[PDB]
Design a protein around this ligand. Structure first.
Ligand code: ZN
Length: 37
């Protein structure tokens, strides 16, 4: 509902998980989610 906060963040639409780095989310999904994309 309340809208007033948005930026450039990389979220994991696979396991609704978040990461600090931008290269972590990429590798994570790759390994963690091998055939779940
Ligand atoms: Zn994930």
């Amino acid at each position: 509902g309340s809208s007033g906060s948005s930026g450039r963040s990389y979220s994991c639409p696979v396991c609704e998980k978040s990461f600090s780095e931008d290269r972590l989310i990429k590798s994570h999904i790759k390994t963690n989610h091998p055939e779940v994309s």
